[PDB]
Design an enzyme around this catalytic site. Structure first.
Site, PDB file in Angstrom:
ATOM      1  N   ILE A  28      -1.074 -13.288   7.682  1.00  0.00           N
ATOM      2  CA  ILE A  28       0.371 -13.128   7.529  1.00  0.00           C
ATOM      3  C   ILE A  28       0.957 -12.259   8.637  1.00  0.00           C
ATOM      4  O   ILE A  28       1.979 -12.602   9.233  1.00  0.00           O
ATOM      5  CB  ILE A  28       0.726 -12.489   6.166  1.00  0.00           C
ATOM      6  CG1 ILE A  28       0.269 -13.401   5.030  1.00  0.00           C
ATOM      7  CG2 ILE A  28       2.226 -12.262   6.069  1.00  0.00           C
ATOM      8  CD1 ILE A  28       0.890 -14.788   5.068  1.00  0.00           C
ATOM      9  N   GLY A  29       0.304 -11.130   8.897  1.00  0.00           N
ATOM     10  CA  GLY A  29       0.752 -10.219   9.933  1.00  0.00           C
ATOM     11  C   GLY A  29      -0.396  -9.362  10.430  1.00  0.00           C
ATOM     12  O   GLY A  29      -1.520  -9.486   9.944  1.00  0.00           O
ATOM     13  N   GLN A  30      -0.121  -8.493  11.397  1.00  0.00           N
ATOM     14  CA  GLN A  30      -1.146  -7.613  11.951  1.00  0.00           C
ATOM     15  C   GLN A  30      -0.503  -6.383  12.589  1.00  0.00           C
ATOM     16  O   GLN A  30       0.397  -6.505  13.418  1.00  0.00           O
ATOM     17  CB  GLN A  30      -1.974  -8.370  12.993  1.00  0.00           C
ATOM     18  CG  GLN A  30      -1.168  -8.865  14.184  1.00  0.00           C
ATOM     19  CD  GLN A  30      -1.982  -9.733  15.127  1.00  0.00           C
ATOM     20  OE1 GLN A  30      -3.086  -9.367  15.535  1.00  0.00           O
ATOM     21  NE2 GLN A  30      -1.433 -10.889  15.487  1.00  0.00           N
ATOM     22  N   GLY A  31      -0.964  -5.198  12.195  1.00  0.00           N
ATOM     23  CA  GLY A  31      -0.405  -3.975  12.743  1.00  0.00           C
ATOM     24  C   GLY A  31      -1.289  -2.750  12.593  1.00  0.00           C
ATOM     25  O   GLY A  31      -2.482  -2.858  12.305  1.00  0.00           O
ATOM     26  N   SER A  33      -1.431  -0.697  10.291  1.00  0.00           N
ATOM     27  CA  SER A  33      -1.952  -0.569   8.936  1.00  0.00           C
ATOM     28  C   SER A  33      -3.141  -1.500   8.722  1.00  0.00           C
ATOM     29  O   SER A  33      -3.809  -1.438   7.688  1.00  0.00           O
ATOM     30  CB  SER A  33      -0.856  -0.879   7.914  1.00  0.00           C
ATOM     31  OG  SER A  33       0.185   0.078   7.988  1.00  0.00           O
ATOM     32  N   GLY A  34      -3.402  -2.355   9.709  1.00  0.00           N
ATOM     33  CA  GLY A  34      -4.512  -3.286   9.620  1.00  0.00           C
ATOM     34  C   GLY A  34      -4.076  -4.736   9.707  1.00  0.00           C
ATOM     35  O   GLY A  34      -2.939  -5.028  10.078  1.00  0.00           O
ATOM     36  N   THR A  35      -4.983  -5.651   9.374  1.00  0.00           N
ATOM     37  CA  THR A  35      -4.669  -7.076   9.408  1.00  0.00           C
ATOM     38  C   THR A  35      -4.488  -7.555   7.972  1.00  0.00           C
ATOM     39  O   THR A  35      -5.302  -7.237   7.100  1.00  0.00           O
ATOM     40  CB  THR A  35      -5.802  -7.894  10.058  1.00  0.00           C
ATOM     41  OG1 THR A  35      -6.267  -7.224  11.237  1.00  0.00           O
ATOM     42  CG2 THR A  35      -5.297  -9.279  10.453  1.00  0.00           C
ATOM     43  N   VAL A  36      -3.425  -8.312   7.723  1.00  0.00           N
ATOM     44  CA  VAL A  36      -3.164  -8.804   6.375  1.00  0.00           C
ATOM     45  C   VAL A  36      -3.265 -10.317   6.222  1.00  0.00           C
ATOM     46  O   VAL A  36      -2.791 -11.081   7.064  1.00  0.00           O
ATOM     47  CB  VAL A  36      -1.774  -8.363   5.879  1.00  0.00           C
ATOM     48  CG1 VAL A  36      -1.584  -8.783   4.428  1.00  0.00           C
ATOM     49  CG2 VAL A  36      -1.631  -6.860   6.014  1.00  0.00           C
ATOM     50  N   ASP A 141      12.457   4.297  -2.259  1.00  0.00           N
ATOM     51  CA  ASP A 141      13.067   3.196  -1.520  1.00  0.00           C
ATOM     52  C   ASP A 141      13.473   1.983  -2.357  1.00  0.00           C
ATOM     53  O   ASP A 141      13.227   0.832  -1.977  1.00  0.00           O
ATOM     54  CB  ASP A 141      12.148   2.750  -0.387  1.00  0.00           C
ATOM     55  CG  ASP A 141      12.025   3.788   0.698  1.00  0.00           C
ATOM     56  OD1 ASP A 141      11.292   4.773   0.499  1.00  0.00           O
ATOM     57  OD2 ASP A 141      12.674   3.624   1.748  1.00  0.00           O
TER      58      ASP A 141
END
Lengths: 285, 70, 70, 287
Positions: A28-31, A33-36, A141
């Site tokens: 889905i994404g990658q950053g 915080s890690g790879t998801v 939030d």
């Protein structure tokens, strides 16, 4: 304790090969915080979200461990829950629930919600808050971007920690005591909920046409924003919005107390959101 | 504008309706944000509290973690 | 922990006998302080130290509590 | 951590109710600091002051609690001591010694103190400072307003903390030392300086810098150090030596409380009872 942290995890991480227990992985994404990845539990069919963390090369970790310790012993149908965690080589895998559908945000801007619909999601959010609070957790939030809507109309609160961050302007949702750097508590979520309720009825954020600093100023002194047509709203709803948006923190309604509020009784079925969610998913991308 | 180093603490003159010892940035954000003189006079602390919050919301980083009660 | 205070640099020009980079309120204070030009040139640093002390007392809502040594 | 605040308290607060051990309550002041009355200890007849504070609505609580921990294990005759602390319902009652009479300030403006008398009050104040400094406490406000006088001539130092207020902030802080007024780092010797200024005030009958502009006075303290005495000629050589040891701009050369207790000036002191007729004449001129 870089060797002790690796010991604590072992007493929490669960057994099994996640590469066997889950199928149909999808990045889905990658950053940072890690790879998801989104995936599915082979045995139960449960759709999930897996965060593969760099481990060793990633900041503070026993805070992450702290969430795990907290959320693994507590579950609620109105919040993105923690399911399992694994140790694969030099990495840490955190598995969270994944709700398909869209965001209340997209539903607010593209369609027109009614008091029945608003009252429905507020109750679900109140349930999540009442649960999170009893667990000594402050979301901080509460806003339309952080509540997930299943095509089901079902409602889940996310982004209240590191593990449950959104898988993929101005603080308009923050309470007066927050924007003025005062000591605050759980009730700042009640305030945010009021703002959200306002956004839903207006189909738009609070302070769009306002400079940031001025908006913060207005929040600190005026408190509640201005509605384009306060008359249209009903008495029970405005009363609801007033219990939520009271500047005096202790005169401000709490989650539990607000469950008993007459406004919710006027709630429509969550299924009533399906066409709105569907219609909303068509436009945006 | 050089020689001796000193620290100046922000102040608010209620009679003139103006902050004193205001750092350059803050002074700039204040007049452009249109926070009126009357509003300032009404709750100077809140105005300073909000300026603080604002320019701090440029330092902290997005990485959010669980927040707990006392 | 005053996030409401900041470092400034002020200088003194012996020829004109005037401070440079002087905060506006400090300049107005010096104007009617009765501290002479000579006295200002004799000990510029003392003048600024004194203004800083005045500022710190005027802008603090310090209730008194027991203070100890270092 | 407003949970431990009560743990600490209940571990130092006294058992019993103030409404039983104390009597003859009579309200004194009223403000944010609390409500202070003047009561008496039923048993011993000891006259005291009770500061009935607003509990949960009182700012720094860990500070007050720390003050009580310091002054509960240490007492001295020349300061307002800490007697007891109680929990009456939701409040925290602090019991402090009470001294009837007046203040050095009223004696000073109303009468003319001589050297023997000043020497006596200086010795007592120096004893109070030696004590406070040994417990690492800096007063910061040694001036005539904060020295309580018994009709006895007895001397007590007050206002060195929260639990010891009136049981100035406009004009010039004429008692502060050069290092304080120029915002440098300072220590206990600032109290020695203030003491020297109090002594000059006592012999002149008024504080210095009275007609001075606050800023000019501050500048003068920072550069000249000592104020301009009106009649230097009249001061004895021993009293001037004493003042000079108190008012040295160089902190290291300035005497400490312990060193000054041995100063010759203190040896020509008159008995504290010499103050009685001054205190009476002052309080009859109403004060």
């Amino acid at each position: 304790s870089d060797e002790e942290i690796l010991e604590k995890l072992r007493s929490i991480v669960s057994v099994g090969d996640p590469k066997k227990k889950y199928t149909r992985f999808e990045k889905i994404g990658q950053g940072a915080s890690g790879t998801v990845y989104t995936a599915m539990d082979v045995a139960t069919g449960q759709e999930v979200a897996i965060r593969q963390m760099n481990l060793q090369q990633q900041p503070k970790k026993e805070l992450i461990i702290n969430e795990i310790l907290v959320m693994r012993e507590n579950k609620n149908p109105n919040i993105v829950n923690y399911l399992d965690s694994y140790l694969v080589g030099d990495e840490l895998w955190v598995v969270m629930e994944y709700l398909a559908g869209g965001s209340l945000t997209d539903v607010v801007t593209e369609t027109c919600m009614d008091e029945g619909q608003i009252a429905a999601v507020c109750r679900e959010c109140l349930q999540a808050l009442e649960f999170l609070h009893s667990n000594q957790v402050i979301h901080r939030d509460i806003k339309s971007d952080n509540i997930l809507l299943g095509m089901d109309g079902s409602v889940k609160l996310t982004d209240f920690g590191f593990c449950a961050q959104i898988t993929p302007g101005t603080p308009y949702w923050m309470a007066p005591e927050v924007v003025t750097r005062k000591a605050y508590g759980p009730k700042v979520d009640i305030w945010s909920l009021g703002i959200m309720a306002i956004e839903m009825i207006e189909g738009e954020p609070p302070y769009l046409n306002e400079n940031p600093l001025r908006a913060l100023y207005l929040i600190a002194t005026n408190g509640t924003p201005e509605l384009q047509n306060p008359e249209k709203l009903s008495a029970i709803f405005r009363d609801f919005l007033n219990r939520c948006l009271d500047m005096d923190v202790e005169k401000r309604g709490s989650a539990k107390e607000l469950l008993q509020h007459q406004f919710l009784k006027i709630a429509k079925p969550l299924s009533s959101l399906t066409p709105l969610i569907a219609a909303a998913k068509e436009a945006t991308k | 504008p050089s020689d001796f180093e000193h620290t100046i603490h922000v102040g608010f003159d209620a009679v003139t309706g103006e902050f004193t010892g205001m750092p350059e940035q803050w002074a700039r954000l204040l007049q452009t944000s249109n926070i009126t003189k009357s509003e300032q006079k009404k709750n100077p602390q809140a105005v300073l509290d909000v300026l603080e919050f604002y320019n701090s919301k440029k330092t902290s980083n997005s990485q959010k973690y669980m927040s707990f009660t006392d």
